[PDB]
Structure formats: C-alpha cells, structure tokens
Design an enzyme around this catalytic site. Structure first.
Site, mmCIF file in Angstrom:
data_model
loop_
_atom_site.group_PDB
_atom_site.id
_atom_site.type_symbol
_atom_site.label_atom_id
_atom_site.label_comp_id
_atom_site.label_asym_id
_atom_site.label_seq_id
_atom_site.Cartn_x
_atom_site.Cartn_y
_atom_site.Cartn_z
ATOM 1 N N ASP B 43 -33.381 41.199 -60.526
ATOM 2 C CA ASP B 43 -33.755 42.587 -60.314
ATOM 3 C C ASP B 43 -35.229 42.618 -59.970
ATOM 4 O O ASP B 43 -35.979 41.737 -60.374
ATOM 5 C CB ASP B 43 -33.525 43.434 -61.563
ATOM 6 C CG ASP B 43 -33.386 44.904 -61.248
ATOM 7 O OD1 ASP B 43 -34.434 45.596 -61.231
ATOM 8 O OD2 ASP B 43 -32.233 45.343 -61.022
ATOM 9 N N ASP B 69 -37.926 39.967 -55.689
ATOM 10 C CA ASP B 69 -37.671 40.892 -54.599
ATOM 11 C C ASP B 69 -36.659 40.250 -53.664
ATOM 12 O O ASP B 69 -36.984 39.292 -52.969
ATOM 13 C CB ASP B 69 -38.977 41.140 -53.853
ATOM 14 C CG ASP B 69 -38.827 42.089 -52.681
ATOM 15 O OD1 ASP B 69 -37.690 42.480 -52.327
ATOM 16 O OD2 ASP B 69 -39.891 42.436 -52.120
ATOM 17 N N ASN B 96 -24.613 43.100 -55.748
ATOM 18 C CA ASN B 96 -24.689 44.510 -56.081
ATOM 19 C C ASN B 96 -25.936 45.225 -55.587
ATOM 20 O O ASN B 96 -25.890 46.441 -55.345
ATOM 21 C CB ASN B 96 -24.493 44.656 -57.594
ATOM 22 C CG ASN B 96 -24.868 46.016 -58.100
ATOM 23 O OD1 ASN B 96 -24.099 46.964 -57.957
ATOM 24 N ND2 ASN B 96 -26.058 46.131 -58.670
ATOM 25 N N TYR B 161 -27.869 52.842 -43.794
ATOM 26 C CA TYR B 161 -27.160 52.471 -45.025
ATOM 27 C C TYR B 161 -25.662 52.434 -44.773
ATOM 28 O O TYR B 161 -24.981 51.502 -45.180
ATOM 29 C CB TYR B 161 -27.467 53.493 -46.126
ATOM 30 C CG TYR B 161 -26.771 53.234 -47.429
ATOM 31 C CD1 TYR B 161 -27.182 52.202 -48.264
ATOM 32 C CD2 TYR B 161 -25.677 53.972 -47.822
ATOM 33 C CE1 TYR B 161 -26.537 51.933 -49.447
ATOM 34 C CE2 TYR B 161 -25.048 53.726 -49.029
ATOM 35 C CZ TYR B 161 -25.499 52.732 -49.837
ATOM 36 O OH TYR B 161 -24.881 52.461 -51.029
ATOM 37 N N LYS B 165 -23.430 49.059 -45.175
ATOM 38 C CA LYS B 165 -22.302 48.975 -46.091
ATOM 39 C C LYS B 165 -20.991 48.717 -45.374
ATOM 40 O O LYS B 165 -20.135 47.984 -45.892
ATOM 41 C CB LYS B 165 -22.252 50.208 -46.985
ATOM 42 C CG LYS B 165 -23.367 50.206 -48.017
ATOM 43 C CD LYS B 165 -23.118 49.184 -49.119
ATOM 44 C CE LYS B 165 -24.228 49.061 -50.117
ATOM 45 N NZ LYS B 165 -23.917 48.059 -51.167
ATOM 46 N N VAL B 194 -20.221 57.616 -58.360
ATOM 47 C CA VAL B 194 -20.311 57.184 -59.742
ATOM 48 C C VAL B 194 -21.371 57.985 -60.456
ATOM 49 O O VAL B 194 -22.499 58.128 -59.971
ATOM 50 C CB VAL B 194 -20.663 55.683 -59.843
ATOM 51 C CG1 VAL B 194 -20.714 55.241 -61.292
ATOM 52 C CG2 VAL B 194 -19.685 54.814 -59.082
ATOM 53 N N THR B 196 -23.768 57.744 -62.691
ATOM 54 C CA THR B 196 -24.781 56.974 -63.411
ATOM 55 C C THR B 196 -25.726 57.936 -64.115
ATOM 56 O O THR B 196 -26.285 58.831 -63.472
ATOM 57 C CB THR B 196 -25.610 56.123 -62.441
ATOM 58 O OG1 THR B 196 -26.230 56.982 -61.464
ATOM 59 C CG2 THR B 196 -24.726 55.082 -61.744
#
Lengths: 252, 252, 252, 252
Positions: B43, B69, B96, B161, B165, B194, B196
């Site tokens: 991360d 990174d 992910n 994006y 994806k 989702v 979150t």
C-alpha cells in the site's frame, strides 16, 4: 475431502435438487448431504435414487427421494408438496434435470421440439414457481438454474437444446429482478465438459478439442460444479444474483 | 462471523494483496488473515498499513507489508521480492489497488492518462508477472484481478478508469490461457457499488439509482467481495478460470 | 463493386481514419473515398500513404494525408488541426491504428508495456477528444474504435495487446454515455482474422483453426470490415451506439 | 428517405418476414419492398395484411402474404410452401413474430408457458428449418431472428417472454454453426424500446427511464431496426454471423 470448505449455513438447510439421481445431480445431492443439509431430490431413475440415498444414509440427514417425470408439471408440483412435508420450506433449489440428446435440424418435429423444451427448460420455471412462497416465508433463498456452454461455443448437433439452455439466461435474469426484493437470489450455473461416468473414451480429436478449448489441462469433474452450488446456496453468496456462473476450465 | 465458510486450504497459504491498507483491500487482508493465511500486502500509505497489521496481530499470522508506490514497477518488484523472503512463494495474488478519481474528457492530458493506466491496470500485469514462477513451482495458484461494473453500466465521469477496468478482461483472459497449463487460475473479480460511502448519505436520486439498479435492495459490503475472493483463492475453485466474477446485487 | 450499398449521407462527409495507409486502414480510406466522402488519414508510412492517395485521386475527393506518429499526442493533435483546415469539421472518426506484435509475458518491461498501450489504446482516446467539439458543432457524429477478437478467444502471445484491445470496450462505452446527449455515437468495430497482404501462408493447423473457429468457411477480407464502418458512419446507424460490432465469420 | 442507403443486392431478392402486418414487422416489409425486394409475409391478421400489401402495391413487387397462425407449425409450413411457389426460393428470412403480453410469475400455467414459447420462439426454429434447403440451393442466405433487450435489462413482468427471447441466442448460434458451411448467416437482431407507444404518452418516470437508459436521448423508431435488417440481408454483411446485433440507443 478435508481440503474443501465447510459452510455452516447449510447445516439443516432444506435443499431440493432436480434430476438428482445421477451425474452432476447426484454430486449436488452428495455435497449438500455432506454439508449437513436436509436434501430432497426428484428423478425418474428409482434404482439410482435408492442407491444414492443408501450411500448417504450416514449423513446428518438421509436424502429424501420422490420419483417424478418433470415433463408432467402437475406431478412435479405434487412431488414438491410431498417433499416440503418431509424437509420443510425449501431454502435452495437446484434446477438441474436436463437432456442433451443430439438431434439433426431437419429431424426436429413440433413434438420433439416441445419435448426438448419440456425436459430442459420448462420444469426450471415451474419448480421455481413452486418454491417462491417458501423462500418469501424464510426471508430469502437461492435458486440455481443449470445452463450449458453448448450454445456459448455454438456447438452443432442439438439446436433445440442450445436454445433451451440459452433460455435459462432470460429465466434467471427475469426471476432475479422479481424475486430480489424478497432476498431470493437466482443464478445460472454453467458447467463445461464434465467428465462423468457416462462421459479416454473420446477419440484423439475430442481430447485435443478439450485441451485446446480449456485453459486448464485437467478433467472437469462433478465436484467442481457441486462446490460452486454449495457457495451459491450458502449465506456466503447473499449478494450474488442474476449471474452466469461458469465452471468450465476457461473454455467458453 | 460463524455463519460463513471456513476454507481449510487457506490455512498457511501465502496470499499477496495490493492496495491492502484501505477499502475492499483491507477487507481482503482481514478475511484471509482470519482464515489462517499468511498474508502480505502493499500500500502507498505506511500509517494505514501499520494500523491494519496491528489490529490483525491476533491472527494465526500477523499480516506483513511493504509501503510503496505501485506506479513504480521497480518498487513493486522489490516489495514482492522482500515479501517472498518473509512469507515464501506466493500462492494467491489479489490485484486490488485502484483509483477511480473522476475526470472530465476534456481535462485528460497525456500525463494524466498514463497515470490512470499506471495506478489501475499496469501494476496488475507486473504483479502477476512477478508471481508466475512461484505459482509454477507450487504446482498452481490463483490470480484475482479487480475489475469494475463502471464500464459495464457505461458510467460517465472517468473514461480512462472505465478503459483501464475493461482492460482487465483482456489481461485476465490472456494470462489464463498461458498459465492454465500450470494449474494457475486467473479471474476478474468485479464489485458493484460497495458501501465502504453508504446509501444513507446519498440524495434521494442516488438511493433510487442503487435500488433500481440492483435486483436485491440491500447494501453491498466489502465482505461480500472478500468471501468471493476467499473461494477463488482456495482449492475449491480449481477449475474456475478466465471468468468475470461479478458480486453486485444483480445490477450490471 | 456495384453489388454493395451506396450511402447518400457519406457524400461530402469529413472522415478521419488513423493508421490509414495499409491494411484495413487503407480499405477504410478506399471505401469512404468511393462513397464520395472527404477523407483524411494519418500514418507513419509516407510512401504507402502517397500511393494510396494517388490510386484514389479519381474519387470525388482525393484523400488528404498527414504523417504522424500517434504515440506523440501533441503531434496527433497538430495533425488533426491541419486536417480540419483541409476537410472541415470531422463528422466520423475511425480509430484504427494498432500493433499486434507478439511478446512473451516474461519479456514485458515497463517501457514495452507503455509502448503497447501508446500504439493501441491511448491515441484512440486522444483522437476522440480532439473531434468532440467538431461533432457537437455538426449536431452529431460517429466514432468507430477498432477492437479485436484476440482477447475474446483468450489468445496467448501478446498479453498487453489483449489488455489494450479489451480496454476499447470501456473507452467506447464511457464515451458513448457522455457523447450521446450530443448525437455522437461511439462503437467498437471488432475484426476477426482478416486476410490482408501481410496475412495459404499458414500451416495446416492454422488453416484448420480458422475453419473450426469461424462458422463461415471463407476468408474474412478488409472490405467486410470497411462496409460495416460505412454503415456505422452513415446516417443509417443513428441509434446504434455503445456496441461491440463484430465482423468475424462467427468465430468469437 | 433519400438520405439512407440503397442496397443493389436486395433488388429482386426473395425475402420472407413473419409477423409482417404490424409493428416493426410492417416496417421490415415496407423497407424491403422499397429496396425492390420480392417480399412475402405471414401474419395472423388477414385484414392488416391486406392493407399493408395494398399500400405497397406501387413497389417494384407488391408484397404477397398468407394469413395464418404460426403457433400451428403445419400452417406455417404450408404458408411458406405457398409463398415459395409465388416468390421463388427464399434468400432472407426475418423471424419477427412475437407477443410480449405481461404475465405474473404466479399466473403462468403449463398451457400459458407453452403458448408463450410457441408464439415467441418455436416458429423461429420451424421457419428457419423450412428455408434452409432454398438457401443451400441459392449458395447462401441470411436468417435474422428477432431478440429483445427485455432479458438483458432483467425486466420484470413477463418471465416466459424473457426466457423465450434469451433462447433466440442459442437458436442463432446453433444454426449459424451448421449453416455457415453453405454461406448462410444467422444473426439475432435486438431492438430497444421502439416507438411504434411513444415517449410523450408515458408518465414522467417512464420518460426518465428511457432517457437514463439510452445513451442517445432520441426516440428509437421502426426504421432504425429495418435499416439494420436490410444490411443484414444484403450481400454487404456476408461475413457477419452468429451476432447479437443491438439497435437500442445504447441502453442494454
């Protein structure tokens, strides 16, 4: 097999499997029984059905069998009623019974067309219709409709079967929309070329086609499909609905 | 939660998760850790990573991590090498890390295009590249690439994006073909909306859109996605490869 | 060929084709020129470009060429500006330039990954970006993005190309949503295995794969793709947008 | 409309359309007649059929028809035989007849299920069966099966219709494989929400649903579908087969 998952939510759960006596149907019956579910199944093959229940008599619940010709909707409804009396309200339905007998385009008659629809598609609708009230009363449930990669590969040799199995997409999606407000998931489970007792008996070209088609060079087995159905029936998949869940080694 | 499955094959299994410190990434880390896996993650945010590992220190294996990174492929490769030293050969990879920041079509520059590809697609390829030899040695493995329903719904607001994806489909399928001869599965895991963000905090129109879109009127949670990833990484899904595995309440 | 359609709406229409000098690109240039469109194209191959314009000098409008390396976005923007001055506001864009050079998974580097994205995907976005204002001013338009069946078949041999071509789905769909309010259609045109000058040179197994893959036992030709692009650019397809329009003999 | 294409290959071509007298069926009849085809159609409604032929009597060929019930396969076969006597071997078939009448899940009976399959799916198979020999003799042909976005959107309100229309995918693909060796193409043509009904007459929510669903905020018209069918029946689309050709403004 101790390597595979245990699903606590399946213990005691009422699970109905159509065409349960042989093939992947029998694998569904075995897997659910070994998870502690209260299984029932319907089939025409009474001898096979009795054998299956006998070898699962040591499960938490011996599977319940009712003989039924699923082309006869009144009979199917009666069988489901008799089953509900024995296992309680149905929480998961696996709409598995099928027949992929080959047929030439030119040889199809109105009656043979109708029979193919009856033995592949029509009972999936009517079995679903018959368990909705139970699932509403339970606060949710899971309906798993068996599809096929046949039509996805554009296979020759059985055009009405290809049609009937593609139809399952529409059935699943339409039911998912209407039943989702009651917590009922509806998904299509799509096997690849499953090596059963019926299916090294191929010729070289057949083996080559599977090896070229699948990404994974291994035999697809009934248990691959059955474990996916366990997950789809368990609480674990509560937000998975309206899917085409393909278990095929990467072919289609 | 004692209602959900336990996967014996995940106990001791080396699992690497990118973007592990927040969001669904943290849910993957927690779920795998609670199944007894030997988890590592990468991360950007060292502080968030430290906090996550600390609150999972009571697992069978405390998760380990490297802060870096992953737009920097050299740094990603170095991190994976350091992780492999600490957890052994990697058996499952959850690709992910992502960034769905909105961008107007007219505002996209060559640099911003490249950065969006770098943070959403590129690292998936290079993380996979870095674990293939391990999985070949182990005799199999599972690579789970995160996709999105964004492009499926044809959402406005982030065209690069959406592109990145959708690209994951091609990455998944291409890798699945080449890696399947070694028992390595590659699948795309596709989340819905989702929580979150949560339904309650949206305006009336936003809530209505999710209710109209999903078949099931319930909030999709990180655990819905994490349980699907568990099944995909476990032995239970050995013949599932090259799929777009959508967990979205029936929206897309 | 007098058997094929004439599209009145293409007469005088400004049409920009990328990678127009050879292959299917040249077929697009020829077909649009023969329909009376005002064609322009970009390519690196100046010799081929001059030859193509020369053999189309007897069309209603001789095609306009500007040399351009489409990995250089500033150059591409400059070329489009120069083209607009000559053919007017762009009404149809065919985002065709591609490179399917093979590459092994292990051999991909950050730079080679980036170059593959640059020559396959990135210029499609930036060419689209550069023509939106023209199409808004015209009251609509048509953007045709070239995809590929490579990823659909899960072909090995070029994972970043498969990724880049699957990405086109997301690009097309995202643009279709944002541009549809201005009457701009965006579709992906997906060729099969097109027999070009570059592509009886196969071995027996290659010919067998095409014959087994395609439903139609005939060679796919550039003109099959070009006629589909004519229809997509013409007024005839005004309500077709966000599609994956596959012209492949039934393979994928 | 002089803006749209003219297809020279349709002049004199024998084209059979089912459900020709109303709806998009009548639009197909008119478009083919205006291209100079030799059109025949079948429909339940003799009066509507007579009116349609009468208003097209100034075409190159006045359309001919047989009024019959295509739930009766004997009647369908007899009609096609009578038509073949009047127009020659059939080169293009548009399998259009349908009935989307709403039905609640709980209200479906075995009879009503069967009737829905009969009026939506079954006749497509049998009409195709009846023209294959003609197309083989002619050295090719085009079969256009009408699908629906209903099941794609997972619409509630008609689960057996959704099923029957999804089934068309399997029918198309199966036939495409077997018929492709003879140059016969088989495709599914998939309409969106066609204004046969119109946006203005809906409530605010209905209009909003179409505007939110479609990428293009315009009314889809029968001619949008009819022009796509022209292209699919014409020589122009000779290598397009096994497709789901969606004309829907970008909704599904």
């Amino acid at each position: 097999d101790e390597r595979y998952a245990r699903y606590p939510s399946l213990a005691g759960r009422a699970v109905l499997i159509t065409g349960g006596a042989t093939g992947i149907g029998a694998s569904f019956v075995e897997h659910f029984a070994r998870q502690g579910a209260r299984v029932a199944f319907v089939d025409l093959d009474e001898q096979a059905a009795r054998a299956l229940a006998a070898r699962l008599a040591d499960a938490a619940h011996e599977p319940v069998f009712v003989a039924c010709d699923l082309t006869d909707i009144a009979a199917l409804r009666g069988a489901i009623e008799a089953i509900r009396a024995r296992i309680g309200p149905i929480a998961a339905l696996v709409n598995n019974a099928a027949n992929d007998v080959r047929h030439a385009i030119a040889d199809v008659t109105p009656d043979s067309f109708d029979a193919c629809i009856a033995v592949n598609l029509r009972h999936q609708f009517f079995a679903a219709q018959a368990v909705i009230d139970d699932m509403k009363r339970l606060g949710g449930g899971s309906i798993v409709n068996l599809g096929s990669i046949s039509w996805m590969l554009k296979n020759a040799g059985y055009p009405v079967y290809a049609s009937a199995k593609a139809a399952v997409q529409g059935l699943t999606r339409a039911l998912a929309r209407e039943l989702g407000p009651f917590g009922i998931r509806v998904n299509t489970l799509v096997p690849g070329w499953v090596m059963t007792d019926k299916q090294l008996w191929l010729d070289d070209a057949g083996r080559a086609a599977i090896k070229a088609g699948q990404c994974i060079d291994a035999e697809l087995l009934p248990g691959d499909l059955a474990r996916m159905a366990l997950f789809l029936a368990a609480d674990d998949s509560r937000m998975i609905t309206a899917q085409d869940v393909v278990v095929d080694g990467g072919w289609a």
